[PDB]
Symmetry: C2
Subunit: 98 residues, 2 copies
């Protein structure tokens, strides 16, 4: 057999820890921190947009990175993301990536 890699550890970013040593925390925790400091700020005006705000911030990179990987090939991009080719096209247009 070979060792377990939980869903958390598939997508990870490099962090430095207490002992000045480069570990790899999940992406989850980056999202957590980005939000917790976002809350620190907004004292105390209302929010009516928090989902789309995040979605936007996450979709742009994903599309970006996959389109680099597939080298502009939308057919393959949409295949590997598991979305409709039309849906992908629509999303690319939302972010001016065409």
């Amino acid at each position: 057999m070979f060792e377990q890699r939980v869903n958390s550890d598939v997508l990870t970013v490099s962090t430095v820890n207490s002992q000045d040593q480069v570990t790899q925390k999940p992406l989850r925790d980056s999202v957590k921190q980005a939000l917790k400091n976002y809350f620190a700020q907004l004292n105390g005006q209302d929010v009516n947009d928090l989902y789309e705000l995040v979605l936007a911030e996450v979709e742009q990179p994903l599309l970006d990175m996959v389109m680099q990987y597939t080298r502009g090939n939308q057919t393959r991009a949409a295949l590997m993301m598991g979305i409709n080719r039309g849906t992908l096209r629509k999303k690319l247009k939302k972010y001016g990536m065409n």
Copy 2:
């Protein structure tokens, strides 16, 4: 002019702010490196699930479990919010 950002630290022990989107880029850039052309199959539901959980975990914690307010705080329908809490068994 940028709401979503994570704290980073450098060579000179200086903390500096960088956007979450840059952090997502790396996460993937890395993920891609690890697989040597092993076709990826559901990369959207993957990333979605890795972001929806922290987001929910947090606003649900901010609104103190008040589903009504958290749904209004995000852009989404209370019913949708419930469907998502179910999806990740957070309910």
